[PDB]
Amino acid sequence: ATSTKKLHKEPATLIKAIDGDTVKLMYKGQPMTFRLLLVDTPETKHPKKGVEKYGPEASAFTKKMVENAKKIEVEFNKGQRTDKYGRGLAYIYADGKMVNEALVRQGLAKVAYVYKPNNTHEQHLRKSEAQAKKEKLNIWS
Numbered sequence: 001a002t003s004t005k006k007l008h009k010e011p012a013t014l015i016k017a018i019d020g021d022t023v024k025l026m027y028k029g030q031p032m033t034f035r036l037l038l039v040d041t042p043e044t045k046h047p048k049k050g051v052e053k054y055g056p057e058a059s060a061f062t063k064k065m066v067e068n069a070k071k072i073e074v075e076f077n078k079g080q081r082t083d084k085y086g087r088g089l090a091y092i093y094a095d096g097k098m099v100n101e102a103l104v105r106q107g108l109a110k111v112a113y114v115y116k117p118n119n120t121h122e123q124h125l126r127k128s129e130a131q132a133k134k135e136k137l138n139i140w141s
C-alpha cells in the first residue's frame with residue numbers, strides 16, 4: 001500500500017472485448033481476461049438462456065468505449081484479485097470513465113456481487129443505477 005493512497009490504478013493495453021462485463025487486457029505484459037467488479041451485463045453467451053434484453057447492445061458500449069480509448073487502467077479492489085476462472089475483477093477505467101459504472105449509469109448493467117470487502121465502490125454505481133432507473137434506461141425501461 002506504501003504511499004499509493006488506497007487503491008492503485010495500473011495502465012494496460014486493450015486486446016479484445018467480449019461483452020459489457022468482460023475483456024482481455026495486457027496488464028503487465030501477458031494477455032489476460034478481466035471481470036467487472038460489482039456489475040453484471042445482460043448475458044450474451046451460454047445457451048443456458050439466450051439474448052437478455054439489452055444484451056447485444058449492453059456489449060455495444062464497453063467495446064468501443066475501450067476501442068475509442070487511447071489508454072485504460074485497472075483498479076484492483078481489496079479482496080481477491082481474480083475469481084474461480086482466471087478472470088480478474090476490477091472497475092477497469094477508461095479515460096477516467098468507470099466502465100462498470102458508466103454501463104450502470106446507462107441501464108446496460110445491474111449491480112451484482114458486492115463482495116466483502118472486494119467492493120470499495122458500492123454506493124457509487126448504486127446512486128447511478130438509481131438514476132438510470134428513476135428515468136427508465138434500457139432495462140429499467
Ligand SMILES: Cc1cn([C@H]2C[C@H](OP(=O)(O)O)[C@@H](COP(=O)(O)O)O2)c(=O)[nH]c1=O
Pocket residue numbers: 021035036037038039040041083084089112113115
Ligand atoms: C463479478 C463476479 C463474478 N464471480 C463469478 C460468480 C459467477 O459464477 P457462476 O457463472 O457459476 O454463476 C460468475 C458470474 O460471472 P458472469 O456475469 O460472466 O457469468 O463469476 C465472482 O466470484 N466474483 C465477482 O465479483
Ligand SMILES: [Ca+2]
Pocket residue numbers: 021040041042043
Ligand atoms: Ca454478465
